[PDB]
Short mmCIF file of C-alpha atoms and ligand atoms in Angstrom, two decimals:
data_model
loop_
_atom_site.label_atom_id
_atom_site.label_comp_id
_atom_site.label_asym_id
_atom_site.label_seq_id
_atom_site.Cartn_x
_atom_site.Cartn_y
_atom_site.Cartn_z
CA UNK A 1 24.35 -64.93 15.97
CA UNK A 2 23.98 -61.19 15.45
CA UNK A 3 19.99 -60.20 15.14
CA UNK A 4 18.87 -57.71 12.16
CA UNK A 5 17.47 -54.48 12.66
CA UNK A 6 16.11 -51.86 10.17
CA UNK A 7 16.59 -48.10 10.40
CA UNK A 8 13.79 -46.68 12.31
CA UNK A 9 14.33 -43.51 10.66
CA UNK A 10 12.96 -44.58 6.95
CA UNK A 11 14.47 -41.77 4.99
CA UNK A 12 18.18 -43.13 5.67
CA UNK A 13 18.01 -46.05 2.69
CA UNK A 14 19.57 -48.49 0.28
CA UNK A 15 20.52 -47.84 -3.50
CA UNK A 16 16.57 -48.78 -3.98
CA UNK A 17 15.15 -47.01 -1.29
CA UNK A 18 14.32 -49.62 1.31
CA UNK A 19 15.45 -49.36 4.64
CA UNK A 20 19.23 -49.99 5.40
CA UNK A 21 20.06 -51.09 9.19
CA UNK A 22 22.96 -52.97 10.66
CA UNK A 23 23.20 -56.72 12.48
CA UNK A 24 23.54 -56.59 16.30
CA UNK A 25 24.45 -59.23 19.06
CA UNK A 26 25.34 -56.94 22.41
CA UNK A 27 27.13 -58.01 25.62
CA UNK A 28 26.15 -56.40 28.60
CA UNK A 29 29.26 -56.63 30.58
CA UNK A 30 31.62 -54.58 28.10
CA UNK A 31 32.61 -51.28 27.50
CA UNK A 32 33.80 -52.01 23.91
CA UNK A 33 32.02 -51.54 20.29
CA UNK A 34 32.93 -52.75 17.19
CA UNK A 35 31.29 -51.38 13.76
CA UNK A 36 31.70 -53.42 10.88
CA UNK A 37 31.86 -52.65 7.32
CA UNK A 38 31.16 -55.05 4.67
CA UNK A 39 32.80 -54.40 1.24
CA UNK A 40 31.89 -55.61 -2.19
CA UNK A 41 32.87 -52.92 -5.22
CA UNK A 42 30.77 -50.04 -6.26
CA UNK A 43 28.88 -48.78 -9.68
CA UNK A 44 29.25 -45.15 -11.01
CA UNK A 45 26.53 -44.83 -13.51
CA UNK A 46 22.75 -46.06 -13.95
CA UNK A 47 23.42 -48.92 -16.67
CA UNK A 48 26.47 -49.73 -14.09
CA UNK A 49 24.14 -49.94 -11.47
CA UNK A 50 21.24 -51.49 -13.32
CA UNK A 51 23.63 -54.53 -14.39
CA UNK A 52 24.57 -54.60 -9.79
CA UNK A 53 20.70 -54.51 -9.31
CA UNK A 54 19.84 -57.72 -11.40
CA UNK A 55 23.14 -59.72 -10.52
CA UNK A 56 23.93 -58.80 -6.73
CA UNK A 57 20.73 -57.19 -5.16
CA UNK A 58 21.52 -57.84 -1.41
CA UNK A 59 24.23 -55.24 -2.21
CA UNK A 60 21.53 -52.80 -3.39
CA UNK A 61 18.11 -53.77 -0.73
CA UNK A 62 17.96 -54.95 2.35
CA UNK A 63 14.31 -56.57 0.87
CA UNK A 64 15.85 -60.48 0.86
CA UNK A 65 17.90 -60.00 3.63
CA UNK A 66 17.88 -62.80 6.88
CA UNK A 67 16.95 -61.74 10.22
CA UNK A 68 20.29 -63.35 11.72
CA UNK A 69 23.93 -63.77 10.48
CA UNK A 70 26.97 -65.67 12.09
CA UNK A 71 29.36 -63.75 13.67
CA UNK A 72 33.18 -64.81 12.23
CA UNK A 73 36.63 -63.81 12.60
CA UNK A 74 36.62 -60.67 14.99
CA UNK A 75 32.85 -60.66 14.96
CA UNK A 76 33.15 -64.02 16.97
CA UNK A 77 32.26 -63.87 20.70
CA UNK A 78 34.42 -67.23 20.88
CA UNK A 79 37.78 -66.34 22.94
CA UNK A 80 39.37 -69.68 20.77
CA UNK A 81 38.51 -67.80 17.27
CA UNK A 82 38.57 -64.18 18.42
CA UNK A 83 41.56 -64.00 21.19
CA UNK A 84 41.22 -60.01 20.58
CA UNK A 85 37.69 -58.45 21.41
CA UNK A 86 35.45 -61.93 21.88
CA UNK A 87 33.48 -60.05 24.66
CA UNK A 88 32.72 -57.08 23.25
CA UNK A 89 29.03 -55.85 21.65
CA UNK A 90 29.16 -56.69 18.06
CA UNK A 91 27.69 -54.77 14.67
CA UNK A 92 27.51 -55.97 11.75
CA UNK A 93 26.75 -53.53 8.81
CA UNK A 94 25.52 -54.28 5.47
CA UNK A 95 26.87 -52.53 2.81
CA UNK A 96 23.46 -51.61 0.32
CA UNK A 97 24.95 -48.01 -0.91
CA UNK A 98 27.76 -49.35 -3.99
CA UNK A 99 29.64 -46.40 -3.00
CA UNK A 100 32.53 -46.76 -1.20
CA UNK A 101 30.54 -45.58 2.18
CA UNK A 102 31.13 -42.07 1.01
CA UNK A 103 27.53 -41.55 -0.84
CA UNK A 104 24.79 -38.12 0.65
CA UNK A 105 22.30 -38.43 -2.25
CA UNK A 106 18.39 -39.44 -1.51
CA UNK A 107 16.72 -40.80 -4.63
CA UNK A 108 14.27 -38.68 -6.25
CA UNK A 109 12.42 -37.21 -9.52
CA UNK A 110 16.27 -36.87 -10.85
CA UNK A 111 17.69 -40.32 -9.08
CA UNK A 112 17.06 -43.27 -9.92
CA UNK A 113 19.22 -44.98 -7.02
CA UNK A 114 20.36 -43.77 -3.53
CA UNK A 115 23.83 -43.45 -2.20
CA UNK A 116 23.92 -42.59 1.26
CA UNK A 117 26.59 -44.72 2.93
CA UNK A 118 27.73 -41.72 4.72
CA UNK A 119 24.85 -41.29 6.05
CA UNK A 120 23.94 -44.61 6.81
CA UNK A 121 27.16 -44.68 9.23
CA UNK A 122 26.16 -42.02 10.88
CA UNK A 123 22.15 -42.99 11.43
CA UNK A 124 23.40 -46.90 12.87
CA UNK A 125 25.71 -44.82 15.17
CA UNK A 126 22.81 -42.30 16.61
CA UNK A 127 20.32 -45.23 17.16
CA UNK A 128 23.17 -47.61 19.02
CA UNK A 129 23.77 -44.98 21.55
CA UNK A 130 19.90 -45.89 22.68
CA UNK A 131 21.04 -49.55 22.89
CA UNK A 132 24.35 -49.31 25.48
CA UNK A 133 26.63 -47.23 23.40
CA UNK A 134 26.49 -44.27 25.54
CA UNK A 135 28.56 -45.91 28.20
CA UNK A 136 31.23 -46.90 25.82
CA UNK A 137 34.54 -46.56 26.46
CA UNK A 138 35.91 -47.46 23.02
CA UNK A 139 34.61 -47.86 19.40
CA UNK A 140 36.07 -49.48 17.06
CA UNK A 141 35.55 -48.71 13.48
CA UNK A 142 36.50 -52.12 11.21
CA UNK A 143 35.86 -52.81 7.59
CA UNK A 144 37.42 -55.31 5.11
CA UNK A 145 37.89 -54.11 0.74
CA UNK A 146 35.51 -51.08 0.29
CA UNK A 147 34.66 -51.17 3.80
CA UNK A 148 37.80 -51.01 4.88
CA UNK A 149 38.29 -47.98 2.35
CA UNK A 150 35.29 -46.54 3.98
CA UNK A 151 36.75 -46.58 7.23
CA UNK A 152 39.42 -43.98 6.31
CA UNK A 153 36.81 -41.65 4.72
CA UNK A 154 34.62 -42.02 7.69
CA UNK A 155 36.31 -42.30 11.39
CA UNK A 156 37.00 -39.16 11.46
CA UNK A 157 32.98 -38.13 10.96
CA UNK A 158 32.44 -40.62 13.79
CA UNK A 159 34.15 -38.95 16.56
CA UNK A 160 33.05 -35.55 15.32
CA UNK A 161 29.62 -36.82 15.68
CA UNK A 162 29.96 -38.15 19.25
CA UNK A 163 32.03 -35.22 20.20
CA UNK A 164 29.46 -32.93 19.31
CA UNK A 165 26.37 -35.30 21.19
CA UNK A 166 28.09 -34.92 24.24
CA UNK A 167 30.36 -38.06 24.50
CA UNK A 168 33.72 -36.65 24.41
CA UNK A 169 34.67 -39.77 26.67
CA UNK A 170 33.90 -42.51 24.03
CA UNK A 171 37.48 -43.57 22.52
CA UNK A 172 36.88 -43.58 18.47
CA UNK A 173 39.46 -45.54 16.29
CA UNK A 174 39.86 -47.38 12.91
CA UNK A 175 40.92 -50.52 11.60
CA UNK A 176 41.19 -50.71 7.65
CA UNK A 177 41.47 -54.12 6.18
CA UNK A 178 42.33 -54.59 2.30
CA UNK A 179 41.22 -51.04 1.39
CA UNK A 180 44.81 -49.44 0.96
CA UNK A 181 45.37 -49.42 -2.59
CA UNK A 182 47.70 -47.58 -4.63
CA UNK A 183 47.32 -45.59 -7.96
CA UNK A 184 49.86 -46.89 -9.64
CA UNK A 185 50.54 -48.15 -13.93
CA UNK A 186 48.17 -51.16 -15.31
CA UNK A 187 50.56 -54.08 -16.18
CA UNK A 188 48.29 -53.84 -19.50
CA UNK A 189 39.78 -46.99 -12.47
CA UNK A 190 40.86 -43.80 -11.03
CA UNK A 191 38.24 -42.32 -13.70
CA UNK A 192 35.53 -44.94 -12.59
CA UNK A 193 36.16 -43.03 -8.80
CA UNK A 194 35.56 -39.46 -10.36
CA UNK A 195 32.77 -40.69 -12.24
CA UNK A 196 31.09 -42.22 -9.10
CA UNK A 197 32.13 -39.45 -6.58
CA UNK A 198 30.22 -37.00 -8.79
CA UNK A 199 27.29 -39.74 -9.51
CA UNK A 200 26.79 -40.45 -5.48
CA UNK A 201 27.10 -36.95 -4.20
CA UNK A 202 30.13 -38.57 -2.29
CA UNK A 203 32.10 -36.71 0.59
CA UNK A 204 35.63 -37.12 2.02
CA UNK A 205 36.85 -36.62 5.36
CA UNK A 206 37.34 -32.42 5.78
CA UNK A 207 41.29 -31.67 5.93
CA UNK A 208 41.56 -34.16 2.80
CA UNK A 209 39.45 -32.18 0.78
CA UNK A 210 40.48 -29.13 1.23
CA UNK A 211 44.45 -30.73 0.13
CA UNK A 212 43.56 -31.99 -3.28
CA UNK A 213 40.22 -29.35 -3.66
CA UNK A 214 37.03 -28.92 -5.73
CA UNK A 215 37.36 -32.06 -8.86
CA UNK A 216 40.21 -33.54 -7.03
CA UNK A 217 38.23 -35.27 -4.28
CA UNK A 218 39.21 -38.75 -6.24
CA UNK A 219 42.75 -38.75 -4.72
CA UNK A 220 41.16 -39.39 -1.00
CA UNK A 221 40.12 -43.07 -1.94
CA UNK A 222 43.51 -44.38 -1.74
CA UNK A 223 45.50 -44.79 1.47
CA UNK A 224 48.60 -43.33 1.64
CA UNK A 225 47.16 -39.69 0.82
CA UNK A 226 44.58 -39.74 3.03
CA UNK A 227 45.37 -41.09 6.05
CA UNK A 228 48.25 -38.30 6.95
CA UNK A 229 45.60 -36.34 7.03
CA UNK A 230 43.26 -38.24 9.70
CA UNK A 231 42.77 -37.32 13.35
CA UNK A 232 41.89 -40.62 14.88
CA UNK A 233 43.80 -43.97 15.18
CA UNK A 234 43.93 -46.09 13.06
CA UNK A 235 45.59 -49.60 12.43
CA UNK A 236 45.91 -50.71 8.44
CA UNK A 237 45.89 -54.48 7.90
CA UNK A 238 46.92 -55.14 4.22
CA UNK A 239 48.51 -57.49 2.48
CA UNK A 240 51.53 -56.80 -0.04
CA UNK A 241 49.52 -58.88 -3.06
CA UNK A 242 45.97 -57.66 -2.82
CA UNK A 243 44.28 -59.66 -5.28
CA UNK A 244 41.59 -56.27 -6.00
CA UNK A 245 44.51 -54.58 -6.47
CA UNK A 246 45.71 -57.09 -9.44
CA UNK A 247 42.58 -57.13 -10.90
CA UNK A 248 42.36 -53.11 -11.30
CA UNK A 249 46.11 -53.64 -12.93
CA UNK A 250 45.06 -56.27 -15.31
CA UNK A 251 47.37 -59.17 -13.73
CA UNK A 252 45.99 -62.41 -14.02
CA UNK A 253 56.01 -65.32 -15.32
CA UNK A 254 58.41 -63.81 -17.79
CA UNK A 255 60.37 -61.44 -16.56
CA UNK A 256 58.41 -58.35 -17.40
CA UNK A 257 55.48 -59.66 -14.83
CA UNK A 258 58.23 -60.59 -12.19
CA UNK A 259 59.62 -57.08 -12.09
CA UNK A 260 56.18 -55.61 -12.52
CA UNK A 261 54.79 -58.20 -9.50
CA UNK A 262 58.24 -56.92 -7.23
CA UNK A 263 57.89 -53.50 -7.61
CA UNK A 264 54.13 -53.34 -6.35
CA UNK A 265 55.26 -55.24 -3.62
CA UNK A 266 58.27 -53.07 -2.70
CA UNK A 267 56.06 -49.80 -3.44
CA UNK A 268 52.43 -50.83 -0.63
CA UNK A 269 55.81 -51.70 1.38
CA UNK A 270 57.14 -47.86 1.32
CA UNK A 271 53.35 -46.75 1.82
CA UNK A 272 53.74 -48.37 4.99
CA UNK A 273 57.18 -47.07 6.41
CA UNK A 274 55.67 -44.34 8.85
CA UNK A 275 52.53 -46.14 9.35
CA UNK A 276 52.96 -46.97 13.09
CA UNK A 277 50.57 -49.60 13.51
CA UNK A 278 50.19 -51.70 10.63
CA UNK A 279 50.07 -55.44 9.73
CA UNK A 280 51.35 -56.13 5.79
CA UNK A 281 51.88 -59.75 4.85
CA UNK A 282 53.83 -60.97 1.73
CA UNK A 283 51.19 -63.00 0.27
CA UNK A 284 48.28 -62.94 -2.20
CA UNK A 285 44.73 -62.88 -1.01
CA UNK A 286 41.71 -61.01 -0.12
CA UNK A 287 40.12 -59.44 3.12
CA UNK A 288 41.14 -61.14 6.42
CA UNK A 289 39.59 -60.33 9.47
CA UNK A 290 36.12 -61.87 9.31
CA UNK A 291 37.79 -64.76 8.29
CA UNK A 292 37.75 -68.09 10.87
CA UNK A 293 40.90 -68.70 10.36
CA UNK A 294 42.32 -65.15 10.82
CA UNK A 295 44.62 -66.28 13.82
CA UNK A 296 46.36 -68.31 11.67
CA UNK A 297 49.06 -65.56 9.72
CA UNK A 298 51.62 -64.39 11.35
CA UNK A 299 54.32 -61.97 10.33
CA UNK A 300 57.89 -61.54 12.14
CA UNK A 301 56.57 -64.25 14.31
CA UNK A 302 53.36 -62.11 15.61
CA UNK A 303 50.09 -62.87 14.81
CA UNK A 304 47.36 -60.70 14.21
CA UNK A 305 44.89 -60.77 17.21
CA UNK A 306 48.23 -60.36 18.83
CA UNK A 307 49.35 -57.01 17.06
CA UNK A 308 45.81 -55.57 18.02
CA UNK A 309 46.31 -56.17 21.31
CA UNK A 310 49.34 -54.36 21.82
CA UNK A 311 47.63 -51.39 19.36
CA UNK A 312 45.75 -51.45 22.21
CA UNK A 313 48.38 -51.54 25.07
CA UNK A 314 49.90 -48.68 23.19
CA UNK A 315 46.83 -46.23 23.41
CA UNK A 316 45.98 -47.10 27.09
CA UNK A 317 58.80 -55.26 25.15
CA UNK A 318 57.53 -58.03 22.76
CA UNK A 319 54.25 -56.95 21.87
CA UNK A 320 55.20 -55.12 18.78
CA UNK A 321 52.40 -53.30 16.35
CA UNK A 322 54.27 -52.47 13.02
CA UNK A 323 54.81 -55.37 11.37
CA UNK A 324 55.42 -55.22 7.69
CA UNK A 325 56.61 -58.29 5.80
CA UNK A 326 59.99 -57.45 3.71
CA UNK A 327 60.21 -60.62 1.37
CA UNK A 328 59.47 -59.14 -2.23
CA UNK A 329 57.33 -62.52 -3.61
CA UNK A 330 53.89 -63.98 -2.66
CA UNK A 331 53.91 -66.51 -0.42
CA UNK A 332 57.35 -65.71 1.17
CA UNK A 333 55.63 -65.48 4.00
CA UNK A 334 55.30 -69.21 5.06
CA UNK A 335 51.93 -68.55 7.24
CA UNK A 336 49.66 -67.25 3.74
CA UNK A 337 46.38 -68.35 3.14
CA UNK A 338 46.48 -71.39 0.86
C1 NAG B 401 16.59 -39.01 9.20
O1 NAG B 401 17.79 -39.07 8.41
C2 NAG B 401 17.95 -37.98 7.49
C3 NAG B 401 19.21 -38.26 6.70
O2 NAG B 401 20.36 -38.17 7.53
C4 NAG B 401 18.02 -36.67 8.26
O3 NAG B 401 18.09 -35.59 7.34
C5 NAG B 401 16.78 -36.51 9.14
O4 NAG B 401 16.92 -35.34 9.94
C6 NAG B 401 16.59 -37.73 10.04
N1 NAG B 401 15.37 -37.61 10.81
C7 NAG B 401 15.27 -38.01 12.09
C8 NAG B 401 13.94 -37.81 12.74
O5 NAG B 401 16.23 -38.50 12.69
C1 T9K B 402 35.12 -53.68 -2.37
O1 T9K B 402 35.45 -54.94 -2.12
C2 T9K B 402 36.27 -55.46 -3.06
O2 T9K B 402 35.82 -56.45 -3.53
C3 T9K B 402 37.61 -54.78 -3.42
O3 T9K B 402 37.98 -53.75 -2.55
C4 T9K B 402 37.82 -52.41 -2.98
C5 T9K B 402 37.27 -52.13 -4.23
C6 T9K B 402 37.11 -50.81 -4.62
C7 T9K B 402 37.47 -49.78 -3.76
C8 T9K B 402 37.31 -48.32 -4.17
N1 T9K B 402 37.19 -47.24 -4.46
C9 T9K B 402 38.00 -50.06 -2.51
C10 T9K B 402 38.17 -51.37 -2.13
#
């Protein structure tokens, strides 16, 4: 179990205004962190939002929230279910901002709703140095669908943080799960971005922005043009049929859908080609690595917690870390979810 604990500093806040904070479970005997961020959409405008608030509150407040959650997947201190990092200090963090972890807007007389995921990052990372994460060695930034979006957009800010705090000796890296997405033809959103960017007062990581430029901001949600541009490591899990990805192209076969279903395939696929470390299977599903059964896929032979490892051998001969499926249908891959 990870234990809950608010924000001490009360200003740093959910879309309506309570307290955010973050779930932790430490483990005094390790050097390693790992930040996780929780996913679950966004809304860009106030009857957006409003419809969120009466439907999905726990992504809005932290008011009904438990004092404990389970940790699962990577978040499991079980070597069995988490061959990878079982002994290092987990965090959990709710996501309570709906936007996309970029968000640096306080409500106010002219807000109705906060969006300060950005900040809210960077407020759980000042108050964990108190509790052990000064004598880190490595943190690990991990997020699955918008959290694993927010990873790319916020790394980066991480390290630039610590570097600045005095910690130029704590290791910062990312790992993005199910938040590369491309911007491609519906079969029958990049608007709903601009609309929210401007609506949350959201940021993007600095070399990004100044690419694509005041109104353009938009372009640094999606993978493959943003992450050239990032400093830090970081290791994109994603697989080839992301069923978010679908639903923004209005999929729900003839031979128009085949080719259409192929070609997205073969396109994340060429996203991937100088991505060095990089985990892509050939099936359709949704988010992975909070998932129990995450040891279970394997691609090329090589399973996940595997492929991590070596990421990490290769920072520090069989133990490869690009592995990108090159089947072109879902479920190819004999190891998919069912
Ligand atoms: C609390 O957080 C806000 C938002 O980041 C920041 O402006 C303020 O300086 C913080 N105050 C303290 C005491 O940490
Ligand atoms: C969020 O969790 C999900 O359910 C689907 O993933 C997403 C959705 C939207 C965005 C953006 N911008 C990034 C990732």
């Amino acid at each position: 179990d990870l234990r809950l604990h608010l924000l001490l500093n009360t200003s740093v806040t959910c879309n309506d205004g309570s307290p955010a904070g973050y779930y932790l479970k430490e483990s005094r005997g390790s050097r390693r962190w790992l930040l996780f961020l929780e996913g679950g959409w966004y809304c860009f405008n106030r009857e957006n939002c409003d419809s969120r608030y009466d439907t999905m509150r726990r992504l809005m407040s932290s008011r009904d929230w438990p004092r404990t959650r389970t940790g699962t997947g990577i978040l499991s201190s079980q070597p069995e279910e988490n061959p990878y990092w079982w002994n290092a200090n987990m965090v959990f963090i709710p996501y309570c901002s709906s936007d996309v972890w970029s968000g640096a807007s306080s409500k106010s007389e002219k807000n109705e709703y906060a969006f300060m995921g950005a900040l809210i990052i960077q407020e759980v990372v000042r108050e964990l140095l108190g509790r052990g994460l000064s004598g880190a060695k490595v943190l690990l930034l991990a997020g699955s669908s918008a959290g694993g979006t927010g990873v790319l957009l916020n790394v980066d800010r991480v390290a630039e943080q610590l570097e600045k705090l005095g910690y130029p000796a704590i290791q910062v890296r990312g790992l993005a799960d199910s938040g590369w997405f491309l911007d491609n033809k519906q079969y029958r959103p990049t608007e709903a971005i601009r609309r929210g960017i401007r609506y949350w007062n959201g940021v993007v990581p600095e070399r990004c922005r100044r690419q694509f430029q005041e109104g353009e901001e938009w372009n640094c949600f999606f993978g493959y043009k943003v992450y050239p541009t990032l400093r830090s490591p970081v290791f994109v899990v994603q697989w080839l049929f992301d069923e978010a990805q679908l639903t923004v192209d209005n999929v729900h076969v003839q031979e128009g859908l085949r080719l259409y279903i192929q070609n997205l395939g073969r396109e994340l696929r060429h996203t991937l080609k100088d991505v060095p470390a990089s985990f892509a299977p050939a099936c359709l599903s949704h988010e992975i690595i909070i998932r129990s059964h995450w040891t279970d896929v394997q691609v090329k032979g090589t399973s996940l917690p595997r492929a991590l490892h070596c990421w990490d051998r290769s920072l520090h001969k069989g133990c490869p870390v690009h592995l990108v499926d090159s089947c072109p249908w879902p479920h190819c891959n004999p190891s998919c979810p069912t």
